[PDB]
Write a structure and sequence with these properties.
part of a larger assembly, 7 chains, A mainly alpha (49), B mainly alpha (45), C alpha+beta (165), D alpha+beta (593), E alpha/beta (457), A: 49 residues, 3 helices, C: 165 residues, 4-stranded mixed sheet, 12% strand, hydrolase, V-ATPase, V-type ATPase, vacuolar-type ATPase
Chain lengths: 49, 45, 165, 593, 457, 457, 183
């Protein structure tokens, strides 16, 4: 029970750090390939769908 | 004549009563005649 | 007896933290994915306004939006709702919209385009048009916002696979 | 507006009903009968008209009011009896001079003369507000002043006006809400559609047991507040006696009694009986009445009302639920509602396909059920409110193979049996462990473990004694008795004790007005202890007969238990039963050697 | 206006859109007789009518209609007793029509001033097996379930003869103080039996106190269903205006059920389970509505419907639905009849669930409800023991069961049996109950509290 | 844009014939509430629509309709798991977007790649009664036929929750090299029950192994049948492309069947026996088509549907049709629940028809097959012995019957009975079996090869 | 050919039928789902469509195959797995890369890229021929000639063209019969 009195709050240290790098790669590749995906969306909408 | 609308449920249980009785009563009969035979040879001697 | 029972209890509470770790990881990852997706779409509609607000570049785009709608309308009169600057834009190419439908369908040229007095906000859509039947039985909602929303359904798998697949 | 196309039975059809929906409140004819457009076929609308026809002609106007048919829930619901369309029955008795609703006569949904004491909420001016938040409260009775006035479900805004403490009418406005422009002015009454489930903050799983006040109902499978239950009937086995008896004995903050489609004599009985009898919550000056809001439909009144009954009734449980009041809703009998549904199915001309019964029947039964349950009360101050639905099911053709019962068992999680053979023999309510289940059991016995009792252990043994008895009885009937094991005889004997003390009780137990859990546990505890000592006693050697003869004095004493009432030990724990355990142990000593 | 068509016995009128609903129309036929019909449904530029006299004669272009402008209502007098009527209330003896002091509606949906006081005082029918076991209260409606293979007409008859001879027994009991009147309605019943009913009223000396509505099967179907509604309405007038105890005896529900069934064969309204209408329940409930204590709470209407099961089972639509609307049931049985018993009444499925509350010690006794409860349990065991007795032999018998086998016969042939002319005191009934129970020890009893038992046993 | 009518659940919208079948349509209300529905039928200038939420309350002129242009398909993804959804697959978790990687049809088949290669390789449920005695190998569809007299939802959860804790134990013995996923589908469910499944999973730590789809019972019937269809499609994608063995738990097939009987109220389609379709076969089949080995065959989709007898009738149309299609059945009876055994699976008429075909080694043992024969036969004999004991007595019973009796009590109270949070791996189960069987000598054990019998008694 | 008027449940009703017979196999819409004409009322035909009609519309073409629901009995029948309407399962497993056949995908009733070596029987140009007579055979077994090519029943005449021994495609012809012009 002492490892269940330490096992809480430890959830968020492991939940953040565990995706600390995933959340940075998500925002990184989005800014890159943004105009090139947007430009495809632009064509579809502005010519018959 | 017996009720037409959903007699099925009671009549099924009648069958299950009957069925249980054949097996059990036959076991009982089987056992009594098995004993009977043993006595027969004893009594005769 | 109770050692074993209280022990099972806390070993179960232990795996609820594994379950909250696993749900919180996956909720964060995914909510960062959703936020990127709404910046792809958000940028589409900032570029779309830019196109729409430059009226001469927009003129063919408006024509083909209405014409796309007429191919799915197939009624002899069509009622057109547009923006304030786009009801005038339509008016001055009435001949080209009904011409272009008659050359791009089998159906004989639309006999009338009804220029509406109810108008769309810049607050709802970025532009585009609402093409509807004359007696208002059927609407082909061909607005720019409606179109991007519809697009999203088919574009979503294309984009999900390229980025995170 | 509309012009009557055809009048067939109490069903009216009207052409020229456009910009109309499918739940609209309408005034039908020149007679201005209250009515509702159930369905529409093109221009022609099929309308169920809730007052009878006897003289309404074709071509009279139909005027749509511009809103759905709803019911009014405001103050003064308690200590008054209404119908299922919800027009006060009492006001009808003086003014029309007709005790039951007269034709062509209309009266609005609540009394419009009654004045109530408004005390302010926990809001002041310029505060942001939301639905089910407490805007005030009205001192409604003497037992309960717990009647919270709420901002309706599906309302938010800022309160422009808060009126100060004082005496007002329930038509006399006290609140203005502004959301985007004037939302509406509000009054003490609020309106709610009887065709929608009332909004809720969240539903929560049931885990707090209600004690029925019937030892037998608690003993085999405990009731819970927030649950769903079936009780079988047969329409001549005293199902009414136990329904009305449960209602008195069960204790909730508000109770809603809904007569679905009843004898009219039975409804009359409850109306008379309740102010004469006392509450166990120390209620005074018409005790029980002050706690009950009563929906009375007889089957002899229009079929529309009787459709409407259950829905109004559930909305009343739900209204009180949002206030943070715990509710017992006893609806009796759900099979009569289904019989009204079969009626509607053939009168409109919709397809029946549920065994000669409606298409919609299975889904409508489920929809009613889902509105009951335990929840965190609507509005943000956070309260606990709950609704336990006790819905009586009874035959609509076969014994349990009728549509009604088949559907209900699917959806119910609590089922408590009632055997007909034992009913005629007077041993009702009879709960049979094969014809009974509770899925709430595991969370409930762990709840009672926290409360003090050993309860889960007693459950298993209670089950075992009843269970083996049924199988041994089948060998007894067919083969006979010439032999039946020493152990098997014991089980039979003890099961008789359980029948007599628990299962039989309804005007035969002089204490039954409310029975605590501890007392039930203590009683059953003596029965189970007698059982284990007895079976051990035959095995370690001692005749079955010597064992009956020596147990003697105690055996009678457990036989007599049922009449005994808390008067020794605590207020819930009884000394005669505690004394009994130790004396039992002494009997075993005499009996083995 | 004029007949467009006739579909089954239902007649399709084509007509302009004006009539009241349930408005009487008179159809002029070319044969020297004009007849009345009631619009069953009113529809878009046509109305479907079933004509109350005959079933033939309607023509395409040789018919004329004129609208009466008034929907059917029963013209009511409390002077209507001591008169002989048919199913429309027309005289058959020439001369005694219904006539009026007031005009009241045939459905009884306008007035409905039924008291919110639950059945109170005792009623008996002078037959011990009825009175003790399923005890009748004023305003209580409890059905008589019978089966054919029976002198079921003789059982109904017996109750009609007995009704009003009971009433001095009841005055003395103080469960009656006020006049007793009979309202008698006949539907599809034999010629011989119609003379039996008239004759039973005559003997009693209550001919003056009764009204007879006679409806045969050669009188139309729609007209059959109206008959009890006329009767019922008149009973409600008796009960309300002059604070009387009214007993309406309504026979035969089965005939009433068929009539409902024959219609809807050209209505848009469609028939549900076993070809019975789904709003058959609704039809029964209109009949049943006039029954209960009236406001003034010195009058009441007690209603006894008579049902013969045409198929014999109780899960048949006619009994099944009725038993639900009512509060309990009373079972007559073929089996008792065969042995040579009269009135043959089985009590095992017979229970009235509002029996205990109505009755009290002041016109019954406190043991009345306990002593009844004991006799059901013992009778039930005796019946199962009998069935087992046949199959296996006397091998499954036990001491209690042998005693129970004797009890069954003892009860059947002393308790339930009595002459047609015989009538019974309730207090008497209760000493005969105790007597039968005297052959069992007291330790074997348990449906009676030990306090109660000690006093009367 | 103009609602013609509503006839029950079925809604008639009057607008042109240019939509295609099962194209989603949007009913736009002036209440600001957009409800989507799917066209059941399309006819000339009208379509018949069943609205997923509600089904009525739409105006006949204040409403508009728009056509989506897309037939209903599920956005499927491998990142979708570990989340709680509705009956349309839309978060109720309050989580992010559904996400797509493909759009797959839920109409009945997405690509149908169900193999022409028969079942082998054990799938473990973690319940002793099922796994040892009725071995299920992947691709097999064995239903649980349970009743309402049992706690059907609680047993269903048990199978899921203990399943996938069997898997590290399998990986070590080398049964599974690829992962295990659960797809759980709940139908017409009660609110307490919906919450119960999530809580059970959370406790074991099986939550992120599974996706739970809850359709609640206040939600209309059409949504409810759509629910398992959504689930089954998701599973076929995980199983084909990323090769995983999937166990699909579908409760309650009886509620799905009811929905199917329920829809039809303006259709010209007539049902068969007991009111249930003649085409009830067809509908069952539909769920059944997604079940079997996937192409590539190391992944599989394994189906266990859960059927509740509402009245304990095995001649009830629902179980009969299913039973013919399915490769055996599991029977769970009320009797054992009553003794207080939990789970109460009587293995008396239960069968797996490809029992031999599943086992092997590395997730079973060789000795598995022989044992299955000893325990079933001995158990059956145990039931027969209980009845005989009651009759003869304890002091007059046979040796062979006495052994059979002892086995019945231990078998029930050790093998079948297991705790709520106690996982029973197949290797664990087989050991407990040898202790029970030991009581018989080697002379009475013989449906076992002497090789085995010598290893383990 | 026809045009779809309505689709109600699994059933499709189609107008502009002036020559649909009530046993005819038709391919409905552009999805080419399998269907067969149960009843005809007027110019409208009632078709039960056996394969899922989600995606199907009204106003779409209805193209007849020109014959009833039939089976083709040809060579190459051994060492094949079929459906009951007969379409090779095996060819779908390879091509679609799905074991079972999903909606809207159809194949000829037998493989048609296959070629067989046809040997003549006992006929020759200008001789009279009747039904059931052996016009040639094909081997498929090395035990028997499984496919004896018989003259079709409902066919007789005089044979204008006999192809000789050699290998031919299924599509390719080998016989012409003259029986009221070219039969």
């Amino acid at each position: 029970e002492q490892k269940n009195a330490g096992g809480v709050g430890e959830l968020e240290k492991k939940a953040e750090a565990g995706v600390q790098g995933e959340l940075a790669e998500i925002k990184k590749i989005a800014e890159k390939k943004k105009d090139d995906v947007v430009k495809i969306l632009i064509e579809t909408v502005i010519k018959p769908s | 004549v017996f009720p037409t609308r959903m007699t099925l449920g009671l009549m099924k249980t009648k069958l299950k009563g009957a069925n249980q009785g054949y097996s059990l009563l036959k076991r009982k009969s089987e056992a009594l005649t098995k004993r009977f035979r043993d006595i027969t040879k004893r009594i005769d001697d | 007896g109770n050692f074993k029972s209280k022990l099972k209890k806390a070993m179960l509470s232990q795996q609820i933290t594994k379950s909250t770790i696993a749900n919180k990881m996956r909720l964060k990852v995914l909510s960062a994915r959703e936020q990127s997706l709404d910046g792809i779409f958000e940028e589409t509609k900032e570029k779309l306004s830019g196109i729409a607000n430059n009226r001469d570049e927009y003129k063919p785009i408006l024509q083909s939006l209405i014409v796309e709608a007429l191919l799915k309308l197939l009624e002899p009169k069509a009622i057109v709702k547009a923006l304030e600057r786009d009801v005038d834009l339509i008016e001055s190419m009435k001949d080209d919209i009904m011409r272009e439908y008659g050359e791009k369908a089998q159906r004989a040229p639309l006999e009338e385009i009804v220029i509406s007095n109810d108008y769309l906000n810049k607050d709802l859509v970025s532009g585009g048009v609402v093409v509807s039947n004359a007696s208002d039985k059927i609407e082909i909602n061909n607005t720019l916002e409606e179109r991007l929303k519809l697009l999203s359904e088919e574009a979503l798998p294309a984009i999900r696979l390229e980025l995170y697949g | 507006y509309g012009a009557i196309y055809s009048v067939s039975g109490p069903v009216v059809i009207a052409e020229n009903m456009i910009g109309c929906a499918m739940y609209e409140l309408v005034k039908v004819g020149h007679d201005n009968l209250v009515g509702e457009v159930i369905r529409i076929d093109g221009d022609k609308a099929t309308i169920q008209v809730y007052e009878e026809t006897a003289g309404l002609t074709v071509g009279d106007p139909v005027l749509r009011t511009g809103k759905p048919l709803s019911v009014e829930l405001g103050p003064g619901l308690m200590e008054t009896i209404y119908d299922g369309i919800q027009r006060p029955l009492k006001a009808i008795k003086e003014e029309s001079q007709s005790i039951y609703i007269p034709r062509g006569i209309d009266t609005p949904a609540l009394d419009r003369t009654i004045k109530w004491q408004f005390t302010p909420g926990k809001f002041q001016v310029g505060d942001h507000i939301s639905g089910g938040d407490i805007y005030g409260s009205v001192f409604e009775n003497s037992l309960i002043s717990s009647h919270k006035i709420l901002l309706p479900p599906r309302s938010r805004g800022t309160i422009t006006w808060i009126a100060p403490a004082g005496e007002y009418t329930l038509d006399e406005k006290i609140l203005e809400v502004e959301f985007d422009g004037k939302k509406s002015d509000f009054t003490l009454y609020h309106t709610w559609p009887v065709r929608v489930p009332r909004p809720v903050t969240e539903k929560l799983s049931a885990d707090y047991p209600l004690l029925t006040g019937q030892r037998v109902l608690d003993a085999l499978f405990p009731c819970v507040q927030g649950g769903t239950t079936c009780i079988p009937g047969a329409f001549g086995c005293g199902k009414t006696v136990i329904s009305q008896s449960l209602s008195k004995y069960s204790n909730s903050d508000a109770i809603i009694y809904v007569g679905c489609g009843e004898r009219g004599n039975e409804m009359a009985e409850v109306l008379m009986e309740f102010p004469e009898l006392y509450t166990e919550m120390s209620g005074t000056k018409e005790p029980i009445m002050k706690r009950t809001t009563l929906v009375a439909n007889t089957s002899n009144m229009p079929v529309a009302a009787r459709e409407a009954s259950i829905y109004t009734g559930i909305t009343l449980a739900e209204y009180f639920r949002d206030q943070g009041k715990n509710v017992s809703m006893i609806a009796d009998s759900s099979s009569r509602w289904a019989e009204a549904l079969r009626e509607i199915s053939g009168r409109l001309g919709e397809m029946p396909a549920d065994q000669g019964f409606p298409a919609y029947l299975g889904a409508k039964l489920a929809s009613f059920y889902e509105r009951a349950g335990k929840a965190v009360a609507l509005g943000s101050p956070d309260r606990t409110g709950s609704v336990s639905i006790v819905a009586a099911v009874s035959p609509a053709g076969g014994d349990f193979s009728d549509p009604v019962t088949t559907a209900t068992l699917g959806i119910t999680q609590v089922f408590w049996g009632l055997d007909k053979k034992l009913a005629q023999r007077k041993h009702f309510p009879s709960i049979n462990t094969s014809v009974s289940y509770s899925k709430y059991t595991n969370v409930l016995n762990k709840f009672y473990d926290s409360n003090y009792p050993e309860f889960p252990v007693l459950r298993d043994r209670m089950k075992e004694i009843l269970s083996n008895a049924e199988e041994l009885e089948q060998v007894v009937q067919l083969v006979g008795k010439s032999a039946l094991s020493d152990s098997d005889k014991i089980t039979l004997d003890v099961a008789t004790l359980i029948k007599e003390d628990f299962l039989q009780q309804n005007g035969y137990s002089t204490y039954d007005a409310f029975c605590p859990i501890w007392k039930t546990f203590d009683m059953m505890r003596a029965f189970i202890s007698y059982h284990d000592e007895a079976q051990k006693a035959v095995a370690n050697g001692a005749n079955w007969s010597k064992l009956a003869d020596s147990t003697g004095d105690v055996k009678h004493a457990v036989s007599s238990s049922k009449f005994f009432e808390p008067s020794r030990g605590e207020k819930e724990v009884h000394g005669e039963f505690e004394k009994l355990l130790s004396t039992m142990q002494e009997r075993f000593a005499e009996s083995t050697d | 206006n004029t007949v467009s068509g006739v579909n089954g016995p239902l007649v399709i009128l084509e007509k302009v859109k004006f009539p009241r609903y349930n408005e009487i129309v008179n159809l002029t036929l070319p044969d020297g007789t004009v007849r009345q019909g009631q619009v069953l449904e009113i529809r878009g530029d046509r109305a479907i009518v079933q004509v109350f006299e005959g079933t033939s004669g309607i023509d395409v272009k040789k018919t004329t209609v004129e609208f009466t402008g008034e929907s059917l209502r029963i013209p009511v007098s409390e002077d209507m007793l001591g008169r002989i009527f048919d199913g429309s209330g027309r005289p058959i003896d020439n001369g005694p029509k219904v006539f009026a002091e007031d005009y009241l509606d045939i459905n009884g949906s306008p007035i409905n001033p039924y008291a919110r006081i639950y059945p109170e005082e005792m009623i008996s029918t002078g037959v011990s097996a009825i009175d003790t076991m399923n005890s009748i209260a004023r305003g209580q409606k409890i059905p008589i379930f019978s089966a054919s293979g029976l002198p079921h007409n003789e059982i109904a008859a017996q109750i009609c003869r007995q009704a009003g001879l009971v009433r001095p027994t009841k005055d003395v009991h103080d469960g009656h103080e006020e006049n007793f009147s009979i309202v008698f309605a006949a539907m599809g019943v034999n010629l011989e039996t119609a003379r039996f009913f008239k004759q039973d009223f005559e003997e009693n000396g209550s001919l003056e106190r009764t009204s007879l509505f006679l409806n045969l099967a050669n009188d139309p179907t729609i007209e059959r269903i109206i008959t009890p509604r006329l009767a019922l309405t008149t009973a409600e007038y008796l009960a309300y205006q002059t604070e009387r105890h009214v007993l309406t005896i309504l026979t035969d529900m089965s005939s009433y059920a068929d009539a409902l069934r024959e219609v809807s064969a050209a209505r848009e309204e469609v028939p549900g389970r076993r070809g019975y209408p789904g709003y058959m329940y609704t039809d029964l409930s209109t009949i049943y509505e006039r029954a209960g204590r009236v406001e003034g709470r010195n009058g009441s209407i007690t209603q006894i419907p008579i049902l013969t099961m045409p198929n014999d089972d109780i899960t048949h639509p006619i009994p099944d639905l009725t038993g639900y609307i009512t509060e309990g049931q009373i079972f007559v049985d073929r089996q008792l009849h065969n042995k040579g018993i009269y009135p043959p009444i089985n009590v095992l499925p017979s229970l009235s669930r509002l029996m205990k509350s109505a009755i009290g010690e002041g016109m019954t006794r406190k043991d009345h409800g306990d002593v009844s409860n004991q006799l059901y349990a013992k009778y039930a065991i005796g019946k199962d023991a009998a069935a087992m007795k046949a199959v296996v032999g006397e091998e499954a018998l036990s001491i209690e069961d042998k005693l129970s086998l004797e009890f069954l016969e003892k009860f059947e042939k002393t308790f339930i049996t009595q002459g047609a002319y015989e009538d019974r005191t309730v207090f008497e009934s209760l000493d005969q109950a105790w007597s039968l129970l005297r052959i069992y020890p007291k330790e074997m009893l348990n449906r009676i509290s030990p306090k109660i038992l000690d006093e009367f046993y």
